[PDB]
Design an enzyme around this catalytic site. Structure first.
Site, PDB file in Angstrom:
ATOM      1  N   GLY A 146      45.446   1.808 -15.480  1.00 51.94           N
ATOM      2  CA  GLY A 146      45.342   2.386 -14.276  1.00 51.94           C
ATOM      3  C   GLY A 146      44.121   2.935 -13.989  1.00 51.94           C
ATOM      4  N   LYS A 147      43.131   2.802 -14.619  1.00 51.67           N
ATOM      5  CA  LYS A 147      41.818   3.378 -14.469  1.00 51.67           C
ATOM      6  C   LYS A 147      41.419   3.239 -13.092  1.00 51.67           C
ATOM      7  CE  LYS A 147      39.940   1.561 -17.916  1.00 51.67           C
ATOM      8  NZ  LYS A 147      41.020   0.570 -18.630  1.00 51.67           N
ATOM      9  N   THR A 148      41.270   2.132 -12.663  1.00 57.72           N
ATOM     10  CA  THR A 148      40.722   1.751 -11.421  1.00 57.72           C
ATOM     11  C   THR A 148      41.369   2.264 -10.174  1.00 57.72           C
ATOM     12  OG1 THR A 148      39.580  -0.230 -12.125  1.00 57.72           O
ATOM     13  CG2 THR A 148      39.806  -0.187  -9.850  1.00 57.72           C
ATOM     14  N   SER A 149      42.787   2.140 -10.340  1.00 53.54           N
ATOM     15  CA  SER A 149      43.715   2.733  -9.270  1.00 53.54           C
ATOM     16  C   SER A 149      43.533   4.137  -8.995  1.00 53.54           C
ATOM     17  CB  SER A 149      44.937   2.227  -9.663  1.00 53.54           C
ATOM     18  OG  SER A 149      45.473   0.809  -9.610  1.00 53.54           O
ATOM     19  N   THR A 170      45.620  -7.989  -8.463  1.00 52.41           N
ATOM     20  CA  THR A 170      44.075  -8.040  -8.986  1.00 52.41           C
ATOM     21  C   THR A 170      43.835  -8.652 -10.461  1.00 52.41           C
ATOM     22  OG1 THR A 170      43.730  -5.624  -7.915  1.00 52.41           O
ATOM     23  CG2 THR A 170      42.608  -6.261  -9.874  1.00 52.41           C
ATOM     24  N   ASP A 176      32.284  -0.822 -15.219  1.00 51.83           N
ATOM     25  CA  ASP A 176      32.854  -2.086 -15.693  1.00 51.83           C
ATOM     26  C   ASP A 176      32.105  -3.359 -15.193  1.00 51.83           C
ATOM     27  OD1 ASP A 176      34.596  -4.124 -16.933  1.00 51.83           O
ATOM     28  OD2 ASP A 176      36.342  -3.428 -15.896  1.00 51.83           O
ATOM     29  N   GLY A 207      44.279  -2.097 -18.630  1.00 45.55           N
ATOM     30  CA  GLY A 207      45.395  -2.085 -17.714  1.00 45.55           C
ATOM     31  C   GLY A 207      46.416  -0.779 -17.688  1.00 45.55           C
TER      32      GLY A 207
HETATM   33  N1  LIG Z   1      51.352   3.760 -10.580  1.00 43.12           N
HETATM   34  C1  LIG Z   1      51.195   2.299 -10.543  1.00 43.12           C
HETATM   35  N2  LIG Z   1      52.303   1.861  -9.970  1.00 43.12           N
HETATM   36  C2  LIG Z   1      52.307   0.436  -9.920  1.00 43.12           C
HETATM   37  N3  LIG Z   1      51.254  -0.399 -10.162  1.00 43.12           N
HETATM   38  C3  LIG Z   1      50.259   0.291 -10.682  1.00 43.12           C
HETATM   39  C4  LIG Z   1      50.206   1.551 -10.965  1.00 43.12           C
HETATM   40  N4  LIG Z   1      48.780   1.850 -11.522  1.00 43.12           N
HETATM   41  C5  LIG Z   1      48.424   0.819 -11.922  1.00 43.12           C
HETATM   42  N5  LIG Z   1      49.128  -0.444 -11.404  1.00 43.12           N
HETATM   43  C6  LIG Z   1      48.730  -1.922 -11.116  1.00 43.12           C
HETATM   44  O1  LIG Z   1      47.878  -2.161 -12.447  1.00 43.12           O
HETATM   45  C7  LIG Z   1      47.559  -2.966 -12.075  1.00 43.12           C
HETATM   46  C8  LIG Z   1      46.014  -3.074 -13.033  1.00 43.12           C
HETATM   47  O2  LIG Z   1      45.724  -1.758 -12.843  1.00 43.12           O
HETATM   48  P1  LIG Z   1      44.058  -1.397 -12.846  1.00 43.12           P
HETATM   49  O3  LIG Z   1      43.520  -2.258 -11.604  1.00 43.12           O
HETATM   50  O4  LIG Z   1      43.998   0.086 -12.735  1.00 43.12           O
HETATM   51  O5  LIG Z   1      43.352  -1.601 -14.133  1.00 43.12           O
HETATM   52  P2  LIG Z   1      42.301  -1.055 -15.121  1.00 43.12           P
HETATM   53  O6  LIG Z   1      42.896   0.130 -15.637  1.00 43.12           O
HETATM   54  O7  LIG Z   1      41.083  -0.935 -14.228  1.00 43.12           O
HETATM   55  O8  LIG Z   1      42.103  -2.391 -16.233  1.00 43.12           O
HETATM   56  P3  LIG Z   1      40.853  -3.168 -16.623  1.00 43.12           P
HETATM   57  O9  LIG Z   1      40.014  -2.294 -17.694  1.00 43.12           O
HETATM   58  O10 LIG Z   1      41.544  -4.521 -17.234  1.00 43.12           O
HETATM   59  O11 LIG Z   1      39.737  -3.455 -15.647  1.00 43.12           O
HETATM   60  C9  LIG Z   1      46.896  -3.175 -10.787  1.00 43.12           C
HETATM   61  O12 LIG Z   1      47.025  -4.315 -10.135  1.00 43.12           O
HETATM   62  C10 LIG Z   1      47.967  -2.089 -10.039  1.00 43.12           C
HETATM   63  O13 LIG Z   1      48.537  -2.808  -9.442  1.00 43.12           O
HETATM   64 MG   LIG Z   2      39.294  -0.990 -13.663  1.00 43.29          MG
END
Ligand SMILES: Nc1ncnc2c1ncn2[C@@H]1O[C@H](COP(=O)(O)OP(=O)(O)OP(=O)(O)O)[C@@H](O)[C@H]1O
Ligand SMILES: [Mg+2]
Ligand SMILES: Nc1ncnc2c1ncn2[C@@H]1O[C@H](COP(=O)(O)OP(=O)(O)OP(=O)(O)O)[C@@H](O)[C@H]1O
Ligand SMILES: [As]
Ligand SMILES: [Mg+2]
Length: 570
Positions: free
Chosen positions: A20-23, A488, A45, A18
């Protein structure tokens, strides 16, 4: 962004769940594709959010993203890769030989080891094979939370060592695996991962102490493995302008600034980048095209978590599995539930199957009636090895025992050992509460053994009810789905619930954790976040969940017995 300057061919994105890797991965791939390069965004993933982010149906096939030209996407599904591997192995030998031998081979290739090795083979084929990915100048790997991404990155070296140690007869994979041909591919993947000119590792984090510690541990381990040059990205930094004339925002900003000023000494030298917090979910090209660049600038009364704990107590004994997407608060909520149950005078066993355990960090004390534990992969692998040697190794002669031990040294036995530990720990829930924090959805679903692959692999070694026979019984299990109020996370929680119901498990309740809507936020950014979160809260309350609780965004991270027990009873 520093990590986007002269990018190598590969770019991994690793970090705690959580963060922000995917974003960040999607934003960087979009930026590179728009710059003119041809990019392939691969998602290692098992539960990938790339398709939900881009609004496209992406499976285990390279599907171009129509919205942004020059960009293609791929999602490495372990099941589809395993099916393709099994087909490649069996189809050529089908028909020529009788049905008995071919079906025996099919059964021997239906274990969990086959799925793991198929996913790993696809990963290393992307890493090494030049002809396969010659059409793509950049491959952007978006990984799962570091607890399993570290294992994935260590797998090439472990397999290369296993094959180079004169071990080509791993009986777990079956005689038809033929790993000897993939030795060169594994070595090439190891070399590519250890070459700073071919791969760049970006460590995503947040302005929180836990995420920074997790990234520091990941950096230490991956530097031990052989990755030289790494970058750091601090996602979700609340802008300083929001801290004005707001208690919650001011507290969050102070905590995040303190976290930044106390960054681990090991990560102080990495090139650092800061990504602020945005007033919208990062879903779609419109939101993703303004993620890496600084933006140019409610009365909610939902059920509390005390009712859920009361309902859990009413039974008096059973399992409580905190499933959900990474970074949603599984560990915090599991610790809070365990602390509350132990404080009531009941015996509680708090466990975590996450390979990167964070229980002692969130507890910080030895509470009364609470027994804390974790599934340590190395210790479990040991225990499994000695158990198998004692049970099956007694009959075999010295040479047979040595061969069995060499077979047990294969990297894939770690997952079977972890599954054995998980089943053993679940079996203890018949007399006392067992609160089991889980790993992210992708790997926890495999751990539950819905398809029975793990059970087949275990009984093949010959060293009793399956875990599913307990998770399917509402009287001795409670699967709490933890999600955020965001798009998401809620989509992945709904997908997890659908998968569980398909497997026969009916989740007991939903927890919308760290929702800005529940808290009182006065800054414009947090008010926008709460307004966006209202729709997801409504969706979870009406459609997805018939029993749920909402936990607000505490202005102080819940750590210790007192803070953990405070969020249960605000
Ligand atoms: N800079 C940001 N500003 C606002 N919201 C953010 C930001 N970065 C990430 N998010 C929010 O973080 C939520 C989860 O982030 P993300 O989808 O990147 O998860 P992840 O790192 O891939 O996690 P996982 O390992 O659980 O799959 C997303 O819904 C996105 O809305
Ligand atoms: Mg991810
Ligand atoms: N109610 C809350 N208010 C504020 N911060 C919170 C709240 N609940 C959780 N957090 C923060 O969420 C962060 C996420 O870590 P946590 O261990 O809770 O998540 P997780 O889902 O177990 O993560 P992982 O996917 O990495 O295993 C924790 O560091 C904690 O600081
Ligand atoms: As194996
Ligand atoms: Mg956790």
């Amino acid at each position: 962004m520093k990590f986007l300057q002269l990018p190598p061919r590969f770019m991994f994105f690793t970090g705690k769940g959580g963060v922000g890797k995917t974003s960040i991965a999607c934003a960087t791939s979009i930026q590179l594709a728009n710059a003119g390069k041809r990019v392939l965004l691969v998602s290692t993933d098992p539960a990938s959010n790339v398709g939900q982010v881009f609004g496209v149906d992406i499976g285990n096939r390279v599907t171009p993203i129509p919205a942004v030209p020059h960009l293609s996407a791929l999602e490495i599904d372990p099941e589809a890769a395993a099916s393709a591997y099994r087909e490649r192995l069996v189809g050529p030998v089908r028909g020529v030989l009788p049905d008995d031998v071919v079906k025996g081979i099919e059964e021997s290739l239906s274990g969990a080891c086959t799925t793991e090795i198929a996913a790993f083979d696809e990963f290393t084929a992307l890493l090494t094979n030049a002809v396969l990915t010659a059409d793509y100048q950049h491959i952007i790997f978006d990984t799962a939370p570091t607890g399993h991404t570290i294992r994935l990155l260590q797998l090439p070296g472990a397999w290369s060592g296993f094959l180079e140690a004169g071990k080509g007869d791993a009986s777990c994979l079956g005689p038809l695996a033929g790993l000897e041909k993939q030795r060169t591919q594994y070595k090439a993947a190891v070399e590519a991962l250890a070459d700073p000119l071919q791969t760049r590792l970006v460590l995503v984090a947040r302005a929180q102490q836990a995420t920074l510690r997790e990234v520091a541990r990941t950096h230490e381990e991956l530097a031990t493995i052989g990755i030289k040059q790494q970058h750091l990205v601090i996602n979700g930094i609340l802008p300083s302008a929001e801290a004005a004339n707001d208690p919650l925002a001011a507290a969050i900003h102070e905590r995040e600034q303190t976290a930044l000023k106390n960054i681990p000494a090991t990560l102080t030298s990495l090139p650092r980048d800061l990504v602020q917090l945005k007033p919208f979910n990062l879903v779609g090209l419109d939101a993703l095209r303004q993620l890496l660049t600084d933006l140019p600038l409610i009365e909610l009364d939902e059920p509390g978590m005390g009712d859920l704990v009361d309902g859990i107590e009413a039974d008096g004994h059973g399992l409580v599995m905190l499933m959900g997407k990474g970074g949603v608060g599984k560990t915090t909520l599991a610790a809070a539930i365990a602390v509350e149950l132990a404080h009531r005078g009941l015996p509680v066993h708090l466990t975590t199957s996450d390979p990167a355990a964070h229980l002692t960090d969130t507890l910080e004390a030895s509470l009364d009636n609470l027994t804390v534990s974790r599934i340590d992969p190395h210790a479990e692998t040991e225990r499994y090895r000695q158990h198998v040697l004692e049970t099956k190794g007694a009959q075999l002669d010295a040479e047979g025992r040595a061969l069995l031990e060499e077979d047990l040294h294969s990297p894939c036995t770690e997952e079977i050992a972890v599954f054995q530990a998980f089943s053993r720990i679940i079996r203890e829930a018949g007399k006392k509460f067992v609160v089991m924090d889980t790993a992210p959805t992708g790997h926890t679903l495999l751990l539950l053994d819905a398809t029975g692959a793990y059970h087949r692999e275990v009984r093949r070694q010959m060293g009793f009810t399956t875990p599913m026979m307990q998770l399917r019984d509402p009287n001795q299990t409670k699967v709490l789905v933890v999600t955020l109020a965001e798009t998401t996370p809620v989509l992945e929680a709904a997908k997890l619930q659908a998968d569980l119901r398909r497997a026969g498990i009916e989740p007991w309740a939903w927890i919308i954790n760290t929702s800005v809507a529940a808290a009182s936020a006065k800054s414009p950014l947090l008010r926008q976040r709460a307004a966006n979160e209202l729709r997801e809260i409504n969706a979870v309350a009406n459609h997805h969940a018939d029993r749920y609780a909402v936990v607000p965004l505490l202005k102080e991270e819940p750590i210790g017995a007192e803070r953990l027990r405070a969020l249960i009873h605000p």
